[PDB]
Subunit: 449 residues, 4 copies
């Protein structure tokens, strides 16, 4: 009777086959609770768990056969169990609703997915932290407005990304905690009428706790929005790092080149070596953001309790989980195999970036910063008008700006001296970077457990 086109638009089995195992696992747990509730005889339970375990095997062996009438994974497994053991299968449905199987399964899938994602995320952070430890002596320009600002260590750069990524890791753990709440036993919205043992369900399925209200457990998708939100910000961080590496990979900047494994050429232009890995990653930010936008829209203005609209969550979660997994591993390969050009990073170190240091120089000699700033500004301009860099002005030139300049300004013109000024926690001085590295190694240790 169902209109074929609507039935097709209604089918979620194509993607939600990814929930085949957690669905059996959840059915198994419920079968045991039903036996304890007196709905199944221990003899029936056996037939049921045996059938379910068999269906699990069919899916893992890639031999399960999806039929036309299967509008979703839940309907598939129920059909299969019935054709295996008959009428007994039908007892498993007692007090159970699809509205609760759907969030229970997706949460089970998400818990497993987060572990994998976490593992990869931590490996990415580690890769950045460990390379930062190895390349701690490298100094290059730091930018604001994409204009050379003040010199910083390449390790300080790798660590800013590592640090941001660590907050992503942290948010990921917080979301996992609310994901880890058992919704099974909420029924279609009013709860379970059998005095089902929810605690037994909880430990069996390995959730940290149970849902507090049946109407909310079945209507909410905060856990989907949260996931999508944190994943989006994680992607945002990756788009910024991509933007950085792609620009630094240009021939104009020349700071680095990715490995051949993470680049591709051009079937038309023979000279090309393109940073595809990073561009792909940068574009995924939009992809994941679209998933977040869609779910927020799907939810807005919907009435309590369950609504068929909610079915759009599955595909969005699965797609973002797969994007993360791929994106994180690729990012790792890139960071660990890319080749920096210590020579070019060094050449890019030009005197004008030391203009702030030149002003502090005068400040140390007594001049108030505002004046010191304008004086340093003049030297920058004098050198420009003269067609040279500031370190090439003469001492009398500096005196023409302020007699406060003494022969010892020569010490201002030393990049190692520049970065080494920033010892206060968080700065780019080498001792601060080593401190950060240690802090991050600890943070990771704690994130892992």
């Amino acid at each position: 009777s169902t209109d074929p086109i609507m039935e097709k638009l209604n089918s979620s089995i194509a993607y939600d086959q990814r929930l085949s195992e957690v669905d059996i696992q959840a059915s198994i747990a419920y079968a045991k609770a039903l036996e304890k509730a007196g709905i199944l005889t221990k003899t029936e339970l056996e037939k049921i768990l045996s059938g379910l375990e068999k269906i699990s095997e069919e899916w893992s062996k890639g031999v399960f056969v999806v039929k036309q009438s299967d509008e979703d994974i839940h309907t598939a497994n129920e059909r299969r169990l019935k054709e295996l053991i008959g009428d007994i299968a039908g007892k498993l449905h007692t007090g159970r609703s699809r509205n609760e199987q759907v969030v229970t399964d997706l949460k089970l899938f998400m818990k497993n997915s987060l572990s994998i994602i976490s593992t990869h995320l931590l490996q990415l952070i580690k890769t950045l932290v460990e390379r930062a430890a190895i390349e701690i002596d490298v100094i290059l320009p730091g930018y604001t407005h994409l204009q050379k600002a003040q010199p910083i260590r390449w390790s300080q750069f790798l660590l800013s990304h590592a640090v941001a990524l660590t907050r992503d890791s942290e948010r990921l753990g917080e979301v996992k905690k609310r994901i880890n709440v058992l919704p099974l036993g909420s029924g279609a919205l009013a709860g379970n009428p059998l005095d089902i043992d929810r605690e037994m369900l909880r430990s069996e399925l390995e959730f940290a706790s149970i849902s507090l209200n049946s109407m909310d457990a079945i209507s909410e998708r905060d856990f989907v929005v949260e996931f999508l939100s944190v994943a989006t910000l994680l992607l945002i961080h990756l788009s910024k790092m991509a933007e950085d590496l792609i620009i630094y990979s240009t021939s104009e900047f020349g700071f680095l080149t990715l490995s051949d494994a993470f680049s591709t050429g051009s079937s038309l232009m023979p000279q090309k070596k393109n940073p595809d890995s990073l561009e792909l990653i940068r574009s995924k930010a939009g992809r994941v953001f679209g998933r977040l936008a869609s779910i927020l829209m799907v939810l807005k203005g919907l009435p309590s309790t369950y609504n068929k609209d909610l079915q759009e969550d599955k595909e969005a979660v699965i797609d973002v989980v797969d994007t993360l997994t791929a994106v994180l591993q690729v990012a790792t390969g890139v960071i660990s195999t890319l080749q920096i050009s210590k020579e070019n990073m060094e050449k890019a170190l030009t005197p004008e970036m030391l203009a702030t240091d030149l002003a502090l120089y005068l400040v140390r000699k007594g001049m108030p910063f505002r004046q010191a700033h304008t004086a340093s500004g003049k030297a920058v301009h004098l050198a420009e008008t003269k067609g040279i860099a500031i370190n090439n002005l003469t001492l009398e030139d500096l005196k023409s700006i302020s007699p406060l300049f003494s022969s010892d300004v020569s010490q201002v013109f030393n990049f190692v001296n520049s970065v080494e000024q920033y010892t206060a926690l968080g700065g780019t001085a080498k001792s601060s970077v080593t401190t950060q590295i240690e802090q991050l190694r600890e943070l990771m240790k704690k994130q892992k457990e």
Copy 2:
């Protein structure tokens, strides 16, 4: 050499196989232009067109074989042609870039897709217009704030949706016009170096014109954003109609019930008959919006010219084209097979909705509207305090509010009289509705051609 994970993240063949035919068609057109440009001998052209036509057959017969190395459809067809005719295949690549094949193919796919979508959209509008013509005598409540406002014809309701949908149709035609501009011959960004005959390409591929600048033709995706944008607004309209029908389908409202073909029951609650068709449609608004959001993000801040980030467009377009096709046809089935309850729509017609008419009554007798409004307000409240509807107050009751009320107020209390006040173009009077119906039939006639 390419990292396997990055290569997988980079593959677009899974979805872009949908472009198999337009890609051959575009290669065929270019092969003929290359022969005219002196790159191919008429003998070579023959081998080439014959090979291409053969590959086209493989795809349509569902026998084409995708190999590991095929990162996209373009790479697949090029590989296949080479293994069919050898070295000659390689001449087809002359002066051609993937950056141009990609937008040429997607535009070719979009042109064909729009025709199908248009056909369905027009059928949906027709369905609403024709039912509105049949059910023109039905009157029910009209709402603002979901509170009963003034009575309107059910046909006036069906037509508001038809009208909005017609603007969707119109926007769809405008987008098609800019989609219909040939980008082939832009190369990787600098244009074509062979003095290729772009006009020949244009007519051959059936585009209305050619791109003006090669750098823009290869960098832009306005045609994707536009499509996604209009599709999103179209979905918005459908979410509002869905919201309406779902609410009207409630037992509390009781105005209508969808057919069984567009509903489904509940495996747990035996009494349920749910309007799945409409909820599915309403949720797609979010889905399509997410696609729009993702592409806008993918594009923002990207430098000229082509960037690998752009590859995310394919899957978003294909997904939205398929959503539209399904959603439009389902919407049509729903509107044409749903059953209204003329009796309940009639029962819902209550006197308080005529309070505005009661104020105009006094206005006709000389009272300024502001005063007429407060007087009518009092009658509404008097009736409430008295526990009756306003048409049940006595004439002396109305006189206690304003002596201006005469025995002829009885004429105010007639719903057919209410709606029939709105004869000015656009209103709910029957003559206005018939006018609208005629206007829409014409609009559709013009949209179709």
Copy 3:
């Protein structure tokens, strides 16, 4: 020199005057650290803190005078201090960047704002929890697909919203923790060169800790995205509750009416009483979501470190903070003053919603659920074809469906009996609702501290 139009587009003083106080407070803290770093003499510090305190007074008395050249609050306060104490003011700028003042100020503003928001959020949850305790005996329909499902307690409904809102409260606390990290002392990106005492800054400004990397502290806006994200989900929850109350406020449903303080009439239609409060709230979901979308877009693909693009964060945060504050308080008024119609909620309780209970009845007598479900389905249909409700079928009618039905089915037809089946934790049975109420009172107690 600056183009007047660009300067206007660049000015953020209109909105960022809201940061006038935290900016002084942050300048005060830095002045004291500069004295300890040897940049200011204790005599200079005095003049500085005295001047700053004076500027603080000007803003709080609403007498501060913004001049043309003030492109932001930071520039305003610096100008004012200089015209008050002269050259000494300029020493305060030593080692300080706008890039760090900007995030330090906004975080200070956000910390204060979250406290207010939290206070209001907790009051909203309390309002729902306490009313749920008072109206615990009320039963009405529960819905899925906006179709009557199974009976539930009105208190179970109020609590689903309370529960969701509690997760919003929890997420709000997590975000506050990362907001509470001091970024001051990061300079323009390389850190602070004076060995400034960041710990002194931390305790002085009351942050829980300090930023780990100067490049990240100045480039990131995770704290803005997080805030916007959680606020958006909070709004989503409020849009669903609004959708519920507006629908329940219809005359068709008739379950409740809001108070006059939270409604408005119509200048045209005298009978109208509209639920403006709820519609306003529902629409804010979109408003806040737009703010989230904008910031995510502003950030995507931006290079390290600071970029002027980031300046868009201020107005988005301030607007959402003000929306939350207003929305939360209004929501509270609505819930606490609305009037339910116990009589209509009772009348809406119809027999078909007990069809699931009727199937369990047969299940208890031995029949497998699948069969019990179809049997109950038949009774629903028999009653329909007969034009009566199911509780009106005769016992022999039920026997015609299944001889398993005995005279005691009469017990199935009792709504208090229906809801009382759900005693398992989370359900709608009265003992479960009282449990929830207790749990939520505790949760709130912990959230508050």
Copy 4:
């Protein structure tokens, strides 16, 4: 009675004062139609138009006084007219609803706003087209993946942006057409009951036509979504151009520097000259996108007809109209006053970008492209391994790759020769660029009228 906080959240006068004039203008038009409908005496009309004209003066002189009770502009003007002429003012409300004043006013405001925006947009395109005509001999690198691709003319670059901006202009005109439809006379939803002369209203207010259905005219906001959508894509284009100019403004690229009027320095780093104008513009893309996202969300799932949720449209439209106006003018200043470095653009022209030309060279001599591509690839690599550019390999070196290379390959190594290959329409050859310039001058001529 209205809760003060809800009343504040409900007030739209702060921003919708921008609609003060179009609101009077719309009231004036309706007053004249009411007189013709027999509701006002010609004597009353006079008092009314005189009062309205007076209120118009108050607003334009900046002396109108907003009172507490004014929840919107419509309520303000109605109050003011009443206190000026008394009871007569109240007759103007006859048959009129706020639901129609609101869309009529906003459309009137949008029509005027589009004209201004169009004027500025066309000036921006002109600025790019005319500079492209002046700097037509300049050649620099063209990029894909931000990697040097093939040489192109700077004019070809300016024109790709001009061309995209022209589509923005075109879409803007299409939106204006649907904006130009008169909604006045739709009442609260059922239409107008006075047989009001809508055609008279149309010409009087200068709309191109009238709305077809009263229910749609009052419920829709397609005209807002459309506007926001096109404005967003326009901003997208501007974010890409900004991304380009900011990168080209780097010292690493060194192709250009903006004028001082469109840059700003750093209060901390004396050497800085930052491209604020472009970064501000790039960030507005997100701002405008957020406005689009919010309105789409506000609309999704809302029931017919009017809902208070719709009130969020005003502020979004006004904000985007003001952003466009500022952004467009600033963009113009930037393009017209920026200074390119013809010398550096020339230096950036390196031999590897000619590798495609080198392959075509062999193709002309008979070699199939695929082979020609790999041969050219080898030369690129040989030169790398040798530490020189390809134009420095010896003829015998090229022979070692393919004996097909003859002394005349020297002609391949000429950049003017490179770009001049692209004469086919749209390419970067000089004759193609002059063609584009002419086409765009015409397009603008037509857009203007």
